[PDB]
Amino acid sequence: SIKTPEDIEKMRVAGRLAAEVLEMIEPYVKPGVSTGELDRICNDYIVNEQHAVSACLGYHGYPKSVCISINEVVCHGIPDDAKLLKDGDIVNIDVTVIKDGFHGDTSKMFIVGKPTIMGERLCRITQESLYLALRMVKPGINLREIGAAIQKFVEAEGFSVVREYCGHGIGRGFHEEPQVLHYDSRETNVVLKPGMTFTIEPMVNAGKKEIRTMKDGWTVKTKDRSLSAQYEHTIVVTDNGCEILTLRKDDTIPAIISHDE
Ligand SMILES: CCCC[C@H](N)P(=O)(O)O
Ligand SMILES: [Mn+2]
Ligand SMILES: [Mn+2]
Ligand code: NA
């Protein structure tokens, strides 16, 4: 759908809160901490301080407040008090908050302790694939072109793109039309228009693109157990570009990307 200025302002607030959770949890992602603990810290912050609520909790039965995925886990990892972080781990924390009826969805990678060279490389390329997509967003561009650009870049840098999970429209609903694929698909044909709000959240594997879903029905892993990274931002298409609603202080791209001269 097409969001109104009123809707957009509310999404700015929800997006900002979601981003602030990631900025807050940052210093706690250390060797020795459990993902279950990281989840409690995030949830307490969201409920007690932001006076908001996690959109993940209860969604199709999801048991926790945030998704935390480690190394070969592609996405939707479930926080667990028994799972401790250790040196070298690459960790994605995916946050989705609901405030004033609107959603804000974002995630970023964190490397624990001493980084591994390929670990740093994978995360770097993944974030750049997101940035590349974001600098492309403007009315007139087709989602298929965006997905094609992401895939071309990722593959050009020696990695693979996960096909089964994608970005999505977002607003008063967690997942709304359209689907935002991170690769070139014949199924995709959507011309962007101002007012559309959606996410871009490429999942990149160091090895092959194939994945597998665990018995819990949530945890997704790379079929070859290679590392997988992901970054996500929620945006709104503007008259001549886009505006990132979940920008953080550490992002190396501005909130508003305009294509004017
Ligand atoms: C708890 C369900 C997972 C929802 C994730 N934020 P996404 O749909 O962006 O992977
Ligand atoms: Mn997400
Ligand atoms: Mn999402
Ligand atoms: Na991973």
UniProtKB/Swiss-Prot annotation:
Short name of one Pfam family: Peptidase_M24
Outcome recorded upon mutating residue 175 to A: Reduces activity 9000-fold for the Co(2+)-complexed enzyme. Binds only one equivalent of the divalent metal cation with affinities identical to the wild-type enzyme
Binding note for cofactor: Binds 2 divalent metal cations per subunit. Has a high-affinity and a low affinity metal-binding site. The true nature of the physiological cofactor is under debate. The enzyme is active with cobalt, zinc, manganese or divalent iron ions. Most likely, methionine aminopeptidases function as mononuclear Fe(2+)-metalloproteases under physiological conditions, and the catalytically relevant metal-binding site has been assigned to the histidine-containing high-affinity site.
Protein residues bound to a divalent metal cation 2: 105, 168, 201, 232
Superkingdom of source: Bacteria
GO terms under biological process: proteolysis
Keyword Cytoplasm: no
UniProt cross-references to SUPFAM superfamilies, sorted A to Z: Creatinase/aminopeptidase
Annotated EC: 3.4.11.18
Keywords, in A-Z order: Aminopeptidase, Hydrolase, Metal-binding, Protease
InterPro entries assigned to the protein according to its UniProt record, in alphabetical order: Creatinase/aminopeptidase-like, Pept_M24, Pept_M24_MAP, Pept_M24A_MAP1
One cellular component (GO) term of this entry: cytosol
Binding, a divalent metal cation 1: 94, 105, 232
Cofactor field: Co(2+); Zn(2+); Mn(2+); Fe(2+)
Ranges annotated as spanning the membrane: none
Chain positions recorded as substrate binding sites: 76, 96, 175
Reactions that this protein is recorded to catalyse: Release of N-terminal amino acids, preferentially methionine, from peptides and arylamides
Protease among keywords: yes
GO MF entry, a single one: metalloaminopeptidase activity
Assembly: Monomer.
Family of the protein in this entry: Belongs to the peptidase M24A family. Methionine aminopeptidase type 1 subfamily.
HAMAP family per UniProt: MetAP_1
Described purpose of this protein according to its UniProt entry: Removes the N-terminal methionine from nascent proteins. The N-terminal methionine is often cleaved when the second residue in the primary sequence is small and uncharged (Met-Ala-, Cys, Gly, Pro, Ser, Thr, or Val). Requires deformylation of the N(alpha)-formylated initiator methionine before it can be hydrolyzed.
Protein name: Methionine aminopeptidase
Source organism of the structure: Escherichia coli (strain K12)
